[PDB]
């Protein structure tokens, strides 16, 4: 059929993920093996993916591939990236951006000018094309725009943001103040995880503000989804937010003597991962950068010292140790060094703090609390102070980015993580992946709307809904809700929560599974893949009840103005849910544009495409499932003139009419019998997957036959001539 | 084949013997068939040879008697024209396009093989009258 002699396929390969192979013999039904040439016998009764014909390969948009599957996407991105040094490729509306780990001279004035005023499609894929389309639709639709730059940190999201902004600035010192804030935002929002040395654990939305004449007047940073849990807990080989290590490595600087910092292994809140140092990073040098950037963004030196006082206070706070006392109560040891320092730095009374760290109000008795409750409260306090510090810093960065000129419109650049899947997934990953389900719903709905519109335009008559996954996560009796419920039960644990999950969801929701050999983990079928979460730590990470009296003590401080400036059970998961709902309202009130940044290798190698890494990245960013959805419809879309031009050689002289469109229609209906395989639009033929590939095969077969006939004749002629020469005695 | 034909084919076969043992290489078998008026594809030649491996193709030697059944097996216009009309409708074919297709599709030929046969048949625009070119290589 399609698996004929000559036909090429992709087969699994450990190193390259997939490897090409040609059918060394024709596949017949009933065959258990394919005869392939990498020669080899490939044991099947699912046949391997077909390789696209050469004419479709290396094109600017992946959705023009006829066999639209993972190896075709991998191969196409690879050849563009390696053979043509093209880092940008479209995937329908999605711009895929592969980090070249090389400064490319493709962002200059001359190039900005060539993209300005052009349509989306007439120019080669580029971040500028996306930035232009956003600028263009902003004015045309009188509608705010969002450029959603997804992927892991270091895949090239900051470059994409930089040049979207550089572009808007040109075609219309905003870009440089925004970039100057990067070291600030990375110090307070990024952390070293097991898989990434500098990972943003929050979503950052930079609204580029435009006046009435679409000139850039300034910017506004909004932040979402901050990973609060990290402030007080790190897993193995992970760090807290960078700023804490910047501060600890700066402990001997004279101006910080009063902060009384030890090294990063001194503090409970920075030592848990056993990774004080990131290779290649000088946290003391990054502190210098951070302070310079703080100065560059208008944060006075007193306020900087206040930021650091507060962080130092969080760190000493975390060292406060509770003694268990009679009747499940607790107390703070006399003259406890961590607390004395904390109270000194914050300027609050030692006894008033020590009292409220071990007691709560119940109204009106003064109840002692247990050690576990005191720890949870102390952590919640640390997280609360951090989150409010973080918001303060952001508010004040914003004072520097805001313009006096009134704002008519904006294009917001969202820097957001893609799906995150480690070997061991916990609450942090669950939240990230939840965020990704919500973002994916917006994308899917967007694309489906663009598709309806395209089909309407062409006069042609399937939606993959992820609402069920979202509901499993966020609806009442869902994973997060059950987690909240388990957290407010005094005997609650991870193990009982696990069982509540199984009781509620196992065999009731096909998106939820339980591992065979564990009752302490669950599996969610997310958009891109199944992810297994370990239940351990979910409860404690979720707890976030801040005690009002502890806050009142901080609110009463008379040593520095910054601390009071910062200020049903509250949970991290619910706060994440609320933040994510806030992010989606912000994005849903705009028209989204999508850039997926992928890291092509793990070693910062210039133009180096590791297939295993690339396949993982493409999946995490949603691309492979987006392709699979596109491959289910009519992904191939050719104008009648393109079809006429390419497939003329397939036509008999008889049916070549003056009406070139009608010719295409008559010829196609004889070449491909099943009329369900394509749809005739006004200007374009829409084809199912595989159809264009099939046309290329018969075309290729026609040319191959003609050629062999000619070349065997030529070979005859040449040999008869040689023979005459050798006969004559030459 | 009668005795006279066999004598004529044998004389031709003997011209291809570059070692003096009355034999040719497997790899020469195709050339001798073509020299005797046949136009087998390379695939057809390899089939009558028994689809040999690289090693026996380069070093196995056959006398006339073993060659003969292969020649026999191989031995036992409107399509040719249409075949050229694939690459055309003014009765021409670019020399550049024909060169490309003959060296990159099918049983690919060397550029030198293609240059030899194409010499003198293309005009100043770089076009070959293929009906004329076809008669020539069929002559």
DSSP letter at A206? E
Say if residue A11 is exposed, middle or buried (CB neighbours under 10 Å; 0-12, 13-18, 19+): middle
Interface of B with A (CB under 8 A): 12, 15, 30-31, 34-35, 37-42, 79-80, 82-84, 86-87, 101-102, 105-109, 113-114, 116-117, 134, 136-139
Phi then psi for residue A10, to 5 deg, are -110, 135
For residues A643 and A637, give the distance between their C-alpha atoms in angstroms, rounded to a whole number. 10
Q: Is the distance from CB of A224 to CB of A580 less than 8 angstroms? A: yes
Enclosing H/E stretch for A479 = helix A479-487
Question: Backbone phi, then psi, for A20, in 5-degree steps?
Answer: -80, 155
For residues A210 and A408, give the distance between their C-alpha atoms in angstroms, rounded to a whole number.
Answer: 6
For tokens 């654990």, the residue is A201
Cα–Cα distance, A20 to A370 (Å, whole number): 64
Are B75 and B67 in contact by the 8 Å Cβ rule? The answer is: no
Nearest to A250 by CA among A306, A196, A291, A296: A291
The CA distance from A307 to A316, in Å, is 14
Quote the CA–CA distance of A150 and A443 in Å, as a whole number.
12
The 10 Å Cβ neighbour count of residue A40 is 13
Whether the Cβ atoms of residue B33 and residue B40 lie closer than 8 Å to each other:
yes
Instruction: State the total domains in chain A.
Output: 1
C-alpha to C-alpha distance for A624 and A223, rounded to whole angstroms: 28
Which residues, listed in sequence order, are joined to residue A208 by a DSSP beta bridge?
Answer: A219, A411
Using a CB-CB distance cutoff of 8 angstroms, which residues of chain B are in contact with residue A716?
34, 37-39, 137
Q: How near does any CA of chain B get to the CA of A85, in Å?
A: 25
Among the residues of A254-368, which ranges form H helices? 268-271, 283-296, 301-319, 337-346, 350-356
Closest CA to A107 of A179, A170, A60: A170
What is the DSSP track for A554-592? HHT--S-SHHHHH----BHHHHHHHHHHHHHHHHHTSEE
- Report d(CA A292, CA A32) in Å as an integer: 68
Query: What are phi and psi for residue B93, nearest 5 degrees?
Result: -145, 130
Pairing mode, if any, of strands A145-150 and A591-598?
parallel
DSSP secondary structure letters along B39-90:
---HHHHHHHTTS--HHHHHH-EEEHHHHHHHHHHHH--HHHHHHHHTT---
Inter-residue contact A185 to A170 (CB < 8 Å) = no
Pairwise CB contact (< 8 Å): B106 & A711: yes
Tokens standing for B90? 């003014």
Q: What angle do CA A31, A34, A35 make, to 5 degrees?
A: 120
Three-state secondary-structure class, residue A317 = helix
Find where tokens 């297994």 sit: A532
Cα–Cα distance between A129 and A135 in angstroms, integer? Answer: 10
Sign of the torsion angle spanned by Cα atoms A616, A618, A622, A624: negative
H/E segment holding residue A486:
helix A479-487
What amino acid positions of A are annotated as catalytic residues? Answer: 153-154, 158, 196, 199-200, 418, 420
- Do the chains contact at A712 and B79, CB–CB below 8 Å? no
Using a CB-CB cut-off of 8 Å, the residues of chain B touching A720 are: 34-35, 37
Q: Alpha-carbon distance A60 to A86, whole Å? A: 9
How far is Cα A645 from Cα A664, in angstroms, rounded to an integer?
Answer: 10
Give the pairing of strands A145-150 and A409-416. Answer: parallel
CA distance A64 to chain B (A): 24
| CA separation for the pair A126, A128 (Å, rounded) | 5
Structural tokens at position A562: 């910054």
β-pairing verdict for A684-687 and A636-639: antiparallel
Give A87's Cβ-side CA count (13 Å radius). 28
Rounded to whole angstroms, how far apart are CA atoms A240 and A278?
Answer: 12
Residue in the block written with tokens 């103005």: A561
Nearest CA in chain B to A718: B117
Residue A267 has φ and ψ, to the nearest 5°, of -100, 130
Out of A710, A715, A716, name the one closest to residue B83 (CB): A710
User: Does A704 reach chain B within 8 Å, measured CB to CB?
Assistant: yes
Q: What angle do CA B5, B10, B15 make, to 5 degrees?
A: 135
Q: Domains of chain B, with CATH numbers? A: 2-77 (1.10.238.10), 78-137 (1.10.238.10)
The dihedrals phi and psi of A78, each to the nearest 5 degrees, come to -60, -50
d(CA B119, CA B104) in angstroms, rounded, equals: 19
A455 membership: H or E segment, kind and range? helix A427-457
According to DSSP, residue B125 is labeled T
Residue of B nearest to A711 (CA): B102
Going from the C-alpha of B83 to that of each of A645, A699, B34, B98, B130, the distances in angstroms are: 19, 13, 21, 12, 10
- Which of helix, strand or coil describes residue A11? strand
CA–CA dist A264, A249 (Å, integer): 7
Q: Does residue A727 belong to the interface with chain B, where contact is any CB pair within 8 Å?
A: yes
CB contact under 8 A, A720 and B34: yes
Residues in chain B: 139
A245 exposed, middle or buried (CB, 10 Å; 0-12, 13-18, 19+)? buried
Resolution in A: 2.0
Strand duo A190-191 + A94-98: pairing:
unpaired
- Method used to obtain the model: X-ray
Report helix, strand or coil for A518: coil
Structural domain span for residue A603:
1-730
- Contact A585/A439 with Cβ under 8 angstroms? no
Q: Are B101 and A699 a contacting pair, CB within 8 Å?
A: no
């Amino acid at each position: 059929e399609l698996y004929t002699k000559y036909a090429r396929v992709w087969i699994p390969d450990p190193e390259e993920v997939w490897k090409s192979a040609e059918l060394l013999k024709d596949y017949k039904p009933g065959d258990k093996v394919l005869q392939l040439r990498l020669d080899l016998e490939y044991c099947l009764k699912e046949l391997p993916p077909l390789r696209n014909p050469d004419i479709l390969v290396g094109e600017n948009d992946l959705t023009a591939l006829s066999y639209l599957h993972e190896p075709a996407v991998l191969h196409n991105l690879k050849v563009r990236f390696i053979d043509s040094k093209l880092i940008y490729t479209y995937c329908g509306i999605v711009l895929v951006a592969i980090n070249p780990y090389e400064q490319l001279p493709i962002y200059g004035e001359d190039i900005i000018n060539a993209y300005s005023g052009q349509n989306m499609g007439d120019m080669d894929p580029h971040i500028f094309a996306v930035a232009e389309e956003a600028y263009k639709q902003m004015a045309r639709d009188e509608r705010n725009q969002s450029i959603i730059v997804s992927g892991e940190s270091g895949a090239g999201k900051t470059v994409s943001a930089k040049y979207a902004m550089r572009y808007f600035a040109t075609v219309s010192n905003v870009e440089e103040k925004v970039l100057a804030s990067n070291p600030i935002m990375e110090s307070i929002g990024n952390a070293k995880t097991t898989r990434n040395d500098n990972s943003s654990r929050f979503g950052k939305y930079i609204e580029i503000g435009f006046d009435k004449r679409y000139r850039i007047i300034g910017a506004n940073m909004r932040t979402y989804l901050l990973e609060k849990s990290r402030v007080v807990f790190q897993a193995e080989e992970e760090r807290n937010y960078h700023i804490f290590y910047q501060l600890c490595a700066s402990a001997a600087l004279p101006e910080f003597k009063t902060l009384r910092l030890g090294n990063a292994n001194y503090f409970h809140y920075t030592k848990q991962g056993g990774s004080p140092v990131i290779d290649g990073i000088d946290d003391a040098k990054e502190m210098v950068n951070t302070r310079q950037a703080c100065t560059l963004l208008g944060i006075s030196d007193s306020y900087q010292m206040g930021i650091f006082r507060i962080l130092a206070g969080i760190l000493h706070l975390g060292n406060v140790e509770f003694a268990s006392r009679d009747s499940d109560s607790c107390a703070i040891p006399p003259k406890h060094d961590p607390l004395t320092i904390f109270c000194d730095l914050m300027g609050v009374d030692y006894e008033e703090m020590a009292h409220w760290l071990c007691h709560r109000k119940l109204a009106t008795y003064i109840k002692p609390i247990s050690k576990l409750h005191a720890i949870n409260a102390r952590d919640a306090l640390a997280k609360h102070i951090y989150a409010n510090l973080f918001n303060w810093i952001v508010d004040h960065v914003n004072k520097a980015l805001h313009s006096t000129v009134k704002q008519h419109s904006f294009i917001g650049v969202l820097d957001i993580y893609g799906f995150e899947t480690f070997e061991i997934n916990s609450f942090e990953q669950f939240c990230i992946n939840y965020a990704n389900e919500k973002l994916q719903q917006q994308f899917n709905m967007h694309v489906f709307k663009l598709e309806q519109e395209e089909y309407m335009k062409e006069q042609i008559p399937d939606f993959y809904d992820n609402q069920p996954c979202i509901n499993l996560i966020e609806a009442k009796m869902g994973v997060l809700d059950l987690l909240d419920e388990e957290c407010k039960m005094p005997k609650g644990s991870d193990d009982t929560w696990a069982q509540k999950l199984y009781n509620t969801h196992l065999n009731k929701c096909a998106l939820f599974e339980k591992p065979r050999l564990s009752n302490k983990a669950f599996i969610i079928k997310h958009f891109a893949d199944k992810v297994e979460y370990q239940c351990e730590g979910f409860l404690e990470k979720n707890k976030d009840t801040v005690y009002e009296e502890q806050i009142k003590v901080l609110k009463s401080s008379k040593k520095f103005k910054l601390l009071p400036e910062l200020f049903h059970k509250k949970t991290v998961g619910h706060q994440f849910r609320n933040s994510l709902h806030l992010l989606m309202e912000t994005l849903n009130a705009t028209t989204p544009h999508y850039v997926r940044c992928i890291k092509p290798n793990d070693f910062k190698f210039p133009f180096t495409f590791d297939e295993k890494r690339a396949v993982q990245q493409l999946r995490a960013c949603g691309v492979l499932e987006t392709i699979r959805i596109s491959a289910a419809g009519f992904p191939s879309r050719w104008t009648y003139q393109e079809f006429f031009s390419r497939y003329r050689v397939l036509m008999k002289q008889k049916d070549v009419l003056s009406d070139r469109k009608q010719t295409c229609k008559n010829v196609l209906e004889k070449l491909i019998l099943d009329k369900d395989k394509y749809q005739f639009g006004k200007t374009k033929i829409f084809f199912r997957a595989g159809q264009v590939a099939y046309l290329e095969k018969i075309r290729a077969d026609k040319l191959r036959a003609a050629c062999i006939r000619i070349q065997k004749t030529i070979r005859g002629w040449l040999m008869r001539k040689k023979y005459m020469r050798m006969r004559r005695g030459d | 084949f009668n005795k006279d034909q066999l004598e004529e084919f044998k004389e031709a076969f003997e011209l291809f013997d570059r070692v003096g043992d009355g034999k040719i290489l497997y790899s020469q078998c195709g050339d001798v068939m073509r020299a005797l008026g046949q136009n087998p594809t390379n695939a057809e030649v390899l089939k009558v040879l028994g689809n040999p491996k690289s090693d026996e193709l380069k070093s196995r030697r056959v006398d006339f008697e073993t060659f003969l059944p292969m020649l026999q097996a191989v031995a036992k216009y409107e399509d040719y024209l249409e075949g050229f009309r694939v690459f055309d409708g003014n009765g021409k074919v670019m020399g550049a396009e024909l060169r490309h297709v003959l060296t990159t599709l099918g049983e690919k030929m060397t550029e030198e093989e293609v240059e030899t046969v194409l010499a003198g048949h293309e005009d100043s625009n770089g076009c070959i009258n293929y009906e004329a070119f076809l008669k020539h290589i069929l002559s």
